[PDB]
């Protein structure tokens, strides 16, 4: 009753590291892209608003 828990733990560990690193890389990409997209939208809208107010004035 104790020689299968060791292999169950081995099976869990063999994939825990891969799952964790995959999730970490996915979150890293998600946050990087989200922040860059936010910055790009902000700069685009600021440039558009500047052009608009300059045209009006």
């Amino acid at each position: 009753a104790e020689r299968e828990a060791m292999l169950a733990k081995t099976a869990a560990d063999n994939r825990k590291s891969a799952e964790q690193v995959a999730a970490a890389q996915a979150d890293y990409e998600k946050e990087m892209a989200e922040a860059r997209a936010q910055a790009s939208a902000l700069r685009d809208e600021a440039r558009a608003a500047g052009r608009s107010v300059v045209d009006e004035k």
Partner: peptide, 18 residues
């Protein structure tokens, strides 16, 4: 850093356009 860069870009481009 990207927020600062966007702010600087916006203020500069508004400056030259005005």
């Amino acid at each position: 850093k990207v927020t600062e860069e966007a702010k600087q870009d916006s203020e500069r481009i508004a400056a030259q356009l005005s």
